[PDB]
A paper describes a structure:
Ryanodine receptor type 2 ([name]), an intracellular Ca2+ release channel located on the sarcoplasmic reticulum (SR) of cardiomyocytes, is essential for cardiac muscle excitation-contraction coupling. Structurally, [name] is a 2.3 MDa homotetramer consisting of two functional regions: a massive cytoplasmic region, also known as the cytoplasmic shell, which comprises several regulatory domains (NTDs, NSol, SPRYs, RYs, JSol, and BSol domains) and the stabilizing subunit calstabin-2, and an activation core and pore region, which comprises the Ca2+ binding site and the transmembrane domains. Dysregulation of Ca2+ handling, characterized by aberrant SR Ca2+ leak, is a pivotal pathophysiological mechanism in a spectrum of cardiac disorders, including heart failure (HF), atrial fibrillation, catecholaminergic polymorphic ventricular tachycardia (CPVT), and other arrhythmogenic disorders. Here, we solved the cryogenic electron microscopy structures of [name] variants linked either to heart failure or inherited sudden cardiac death.
We also present the cryo-EM structures of the [name]-phosphorylated human CPVT-linked [name]-[name] and [name]-R420W under conditions that resemble those present during diastole and show that both mutant channels are in the primed state and that the Rycal drug [name] stabilizes the closed state of the mutant channels. Moreover, by analyzing two different mutations at the same residue, we were able to determine whether the identity of the mutant residue differentially affects the local and global structures. Recombinant human isoforms of the [name]-phosphorylated CPVT-linked [name]-[name] and [name]-R420W channels were expressed in HEK-293 cells and purified as previously described. Treatment with the Rycal drug [name] partially reversed these movements, reaching a conformation closer to that of the closed state of WT [name]. Treatment with [name] reduced the RMSD values by 0.18 (n = 4, SD = 0.025, p = 0.0004) for the three CPVT channels and the HF channel analyzed, strongly confirming a common inhibitory mechanism. Similarly to [name]-R2474S10, we detected an increased density in the cleft of the RY1&2 domain of [name]-[name], [name]-R420W treated with [name], where Rycals were shown to bind. We also detected an increased density in between the BSol1 and RY1&2 domains. This suggests that binding of [name] to the RY1&2 domain affects the local structure and stabilizes the interaction with the BSol1 domain, which in turn stabilizes the upward-inward conformation of the cytoplasmic shell associated with a stable closed pore of the channel in agreement with our previous reports. As expected, we found that the primed state exhibited weakened affinity for calstabin-2 (50-100% increase in Kd caused by increased koff) and treatment with [name], which reverses the primed state, increased the affinity of calstabin-2 to [name].
Numbering used by the authors:
A (entry chain C): 436 to 869
B (entry chain G): 2 to 108
C (entry chain C): 3666 to 3702, 3710 to 3858
D (entry chain C): 1207 to 1316, 1414 to 1854, 1889 to 1929
E (entry chain C): 2053 to 2315
Amino acid sequence: LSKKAKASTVDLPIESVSLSLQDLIGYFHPPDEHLEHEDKQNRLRALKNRQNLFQEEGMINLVLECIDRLHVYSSAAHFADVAGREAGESWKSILNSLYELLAALIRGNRKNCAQFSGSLDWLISRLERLEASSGILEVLHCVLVESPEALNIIKEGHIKSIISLLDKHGRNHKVLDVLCSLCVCHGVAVRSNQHLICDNLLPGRDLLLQTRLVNHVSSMRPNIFLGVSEGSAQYKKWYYELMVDHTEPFVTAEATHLRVGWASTEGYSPYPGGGEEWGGNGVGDDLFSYGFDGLHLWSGCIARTVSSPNQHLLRTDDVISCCLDLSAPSISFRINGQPVQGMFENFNIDGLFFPVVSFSAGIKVRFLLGGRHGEFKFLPPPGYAPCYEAVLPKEKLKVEHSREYKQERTYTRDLLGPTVSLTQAAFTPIPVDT
Amino acid sequence: GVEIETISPGDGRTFPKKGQTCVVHYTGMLQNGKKFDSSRDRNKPFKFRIGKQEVIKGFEEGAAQMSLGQRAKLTCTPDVAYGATGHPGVIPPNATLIFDVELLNLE
Amino acid sequence: QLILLFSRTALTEKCKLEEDFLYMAYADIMAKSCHDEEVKSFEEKEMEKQKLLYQQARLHDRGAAEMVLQTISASKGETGPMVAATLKLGIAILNGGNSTVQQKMLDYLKEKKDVGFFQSLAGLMQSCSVLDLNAFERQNKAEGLGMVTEEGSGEKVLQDDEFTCDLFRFLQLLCEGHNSDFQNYL
Amino acid sequence: LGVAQVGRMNFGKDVSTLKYFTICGLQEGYEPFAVNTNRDITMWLSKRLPQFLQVPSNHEHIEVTRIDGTIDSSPCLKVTQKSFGSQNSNTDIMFYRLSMPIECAEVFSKRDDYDFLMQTSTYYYSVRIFPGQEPANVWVGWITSDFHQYDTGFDLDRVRTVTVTLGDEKGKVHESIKRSNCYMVCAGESMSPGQGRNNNGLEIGCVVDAASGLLTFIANGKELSTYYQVEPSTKLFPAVFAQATSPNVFQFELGRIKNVMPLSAGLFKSEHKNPVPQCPPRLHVQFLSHVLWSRMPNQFLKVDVSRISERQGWLVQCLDPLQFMSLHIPEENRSVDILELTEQEELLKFHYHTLRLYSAVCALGNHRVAHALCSHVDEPQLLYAIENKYMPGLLRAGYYDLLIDIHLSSYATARLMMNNEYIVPMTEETKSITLFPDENKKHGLPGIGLSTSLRPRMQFSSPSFVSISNECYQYSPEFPLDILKSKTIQMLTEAVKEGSLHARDPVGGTTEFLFVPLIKLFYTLLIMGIFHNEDLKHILQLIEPSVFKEAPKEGLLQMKLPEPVKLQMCLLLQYLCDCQVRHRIEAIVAFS
Amino acid sequence: KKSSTLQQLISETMVRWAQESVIEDPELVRAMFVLLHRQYDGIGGLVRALPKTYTINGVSVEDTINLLASLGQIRSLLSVRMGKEEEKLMIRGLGDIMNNKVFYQHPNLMRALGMHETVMEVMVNVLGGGESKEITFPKMVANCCRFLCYFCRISRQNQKAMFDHLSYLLENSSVGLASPAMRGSTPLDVAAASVMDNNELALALREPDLEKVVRYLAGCGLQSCQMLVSKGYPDIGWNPVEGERYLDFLRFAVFCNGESVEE
């Protein structure tokens, strides 16, 4: 077929080869676990003898030749174009059965796995192909587990190819197990392979899943549901303050989180949007929240360093004043009366805004919402109205958790369904046209 | 090649010299955001003496410029932080290092 | 459970019978338990015979006869402590020409069609040592020169007379009482 | 629960809480769901925020096929609606993305030539909208990991955006950065000539300059006016939002154009210099969906809030620390609490095998690799895995193995190799040793006593990476052994007390996962010899209160233990016997 | 009643477990029965332990601890595969042993610790992992052989302990004989040191052991040296360089203390 003969002239026993491969797989099928110990041992001895006879008659090289001559065709379509449509249909099946037969012929037989050392280098050279990846991986695993001599030929190139298999084919624990067998075999550790696997896999931090301890972060907000809309009786400018009575820089090994600013709600639902209800996220960790921490303006989980007189992370006895203008989207901060030299602009205004503070353990913050509830230390900038002035007449201004759930006994914990939209927060008069 | 950004102010008068063991807590991180070391994770302060290259040169210069009781962010380029060979298994080649360093105490 | 563990270990196929301290100890313990040993009366002699039969039943009811055959078969004709203690255990359970043990041994061999047992028996017989006059001459020359003998009995000459005697005693106990079936099967 | 509905679920951990149990259920014999649980039952709710996940093969609406690239054809991933033309078909916009991001440069700078292809960083992909699919309903561009919007009506105006303007002290805006999760264009508007999708399928080609962060789009061979500028270090996911108006919706083409290196080179690090386009199996289409669950934390931060006074305002205080160990998926730029892997079987298995690889690479005294691994797995993470009572059993058993191998295995195996050889100095402290503590010939408690036999030194090295000397690679990394010992004793005591009732909720899911790893760590510590006197007495009382009382409660020996636990208990008893033998040998030498 | 003793407690517990349940794990079965046998045969523990017991003077404690650490470093190398760094560790580990004074003052302690078996095992590992493919890491093999010969020369009992391993060494005689600058550092040299100047050992030496050397010498007299002809030496049919080493070993086997061992 490779020498370009007519299909009719070519005698290609596809069906016979497939059925014979199935029969050989059944012949070399390993013993089952349900078997009694003596019978299991007898089957194991029979399989060992069969493998010995096959390899002594050199049936391994024949399988290798068949596999090599089959890989010349890139795909089933190409093989069908060369030989015929049945050949194309059965090409992948024949390759898989051949690889399974090789694995069955060499499995558990140290002599065969030692004789396969010469071909191991040729074997790893086709690991990239999806036509044979699983079979080649299984054969490689069997050889590495069984034969100590197999490890002595694995070099940097083969280990790098095995690792790149993870990057190209995604996560697969079989590659991990092959790499583990490349480290310690029969109670002996190969330090060169250990070092190569470490230095070629670990430092990237791009394939293996990464782990880290993150301090729990909670968010707190008042009742007010500041918003902007056309023809709505709402005042576009707003102002509030937060003073940090006490804060510990490092309650744990991780730095203490303390950020203050504004957050919006997707649509008119009263539930804050775009952020996880629980976790290590807080103000500024999403594109729905806008935060300041004394050194950084935080938005979309991105921090930009902002200049300020006497720059410092939020310390004890620090007063942060937050100003919001919805007429031209603007969020501004002033620390201890001094103006912060950065501001948020042109953010989405199709929602309801509200003050918010995100924190981890070790905070003693205090909301100064203006007026009777809190007493502003620094007078509000002209135009901006204090935040207590947005409370609805019936409702009462209180500071509650941003998210629904909180720390309490499980049987007392209230499970909440979806909340109703809060479109009534923005009172837009709709008069009947006359 | 080292950049210093003060997170917390120090005394402003005491700086490390010759002969002084600097005691720090550092929380070194890569530029992408992944943390690769923390003396606060190890719960023991790190002690190193100036001018005898016990530490990397970027860390040395950053701690020299820092003052007592001052927390600062140290941005170190690869040329002063492990070079281009990198640290095998920990730091990839040609990686800038961000350190959060607090100079606790000086003798 | 102990005997079944020892039988499974023997039945597992390995290229060589690995020395097992556990077998070395427990085979000896079981061998001593069986015998548990100047004129005596007929009644007390018969009582000793009956007690020995019960102490041998305590083991051969639990697969000891099969285990001491499997271990010899797995020995593959290699003289060693393992087979040396297996022979002692077989002798202990077979003392007095125990017909039940003889029948169990013959039935197991016939059923399993074990050729390895007899091949290992022939190998052990070939491996059995004899008097070596060259070794005796060297030993005498050492004494004549005056180096202190590490072994006083000349254990180099006639290396293991205990093993050979135990092997042939086992083979004799296999046929005592005129056991024609096993005599012909040998 | 529907809209504005409130309910409480009582599993009956405290039977008294169940209000109607006695009148119905008790005499019938029904038991509370949490009758025999020492821990709160973990609750999983429906996730509010949609996430991207790979399109299932059994999906009844969307089908994705991978077209291999021939010599003349680039690799293609074709998205089509199998449910089109059938009842219950969904006329809703679907949000598709590729599984891997292009990462922009950390710092932005201030026949095509092969050298140019090698030095350039611009990457390209394309989207062919199949003719007849209304391109006004099709959007092409890039999105970031933050995209979590499933509005049925999508338009380029609703995309979330902000502009951080940083100005000098005077107030002059020295820079302004626009940040948005969505960077996409519409094919309908990209039809600058008009009816471009009619005669042939419309081709939108997205090019990203990873060195400068410029995103530009070319339709029908001409560069469209709309362009985007992204900040450094942004990860951009190729994305298409399409409302299917045809059986065939669109096609991702991973080809390349003049002077632009294809997308696979940017995605994969191995092919960073490979001009040939590729579509390896890792790359796959992921569609936005709500079919995911979410685990509520067992414990939340305790925060107290109150109005101190009219002047003082409101007060928000939090003083108790809590932490959760977050597992970060690298390719998706995501992060999930590791306890969420209790239901994600594939990630659980892959991470367990990753832990096994971590143990294997540092196995058998590879101290340098252990020092390297201390960076990836920190001692706070190890201790949190030590103590956590909700961790999956596989992760528990892997993390104790790492804690043993990185820190304790070397000294443990040195002590085990030197165990059977007794070299005892002949000194005044050795002279005092006696077989029996007093006149009454009563055995002292095993282990407790004065042993003078020579013992290997215990030395550890601090694992710091700012240091430069390589000698620190010698010796196993240091660990807080006292804290580890205290936690081990505490957890053993609690485990014995809990297992004495045979609770339905063992730590790790099974009694094996609860005990085998704990007893393994305990045995390793005992072998090393950290335990001293009183701690040894307490652990011996835990083992058996009756025998080891110094002269109701059941020790570990008689608690109907599984076989793996029995094996380690046998190992513990073997160590105690070895201690007795060593004491006897020292007493004989003292008499000598 | 009250057990009051760890021995009785274990003896009760193992039997209770075994009689309560059918144990499926053979490793568990071995563990419990080993423990039970240890409890019942207490005197056997002493019989096994006392030969491994050594007493040293108080002044020698620090040196003995250093030597024990060196021996442990050498022992740990068995678990790892042969490499350059392991070769360096083995070399300076052996150097410390020679430098330590306890090595000479307490040869019985070293024989009990079984250092020579460990060095033998490392050498066997190398010769398995590079005997036929030409001796890899020859420097560490040479150092091991030198150490073992010095061990023979330290004391006459050590010479007998080393002679007990003669059979393997004679089979690995053809390691580096043809390579000079390694003379006195091949396993054949170690065998010669094992059977050098000891009448008892020379007499105890068997005829097959000499037959192995005679066969090697016959091979060297019939066929030339493959490694030499690979280097390009003129090809004469026979090998003098390898044959001379075997002749020296035969000389040491037959002639002792000025006397000729007639046997």
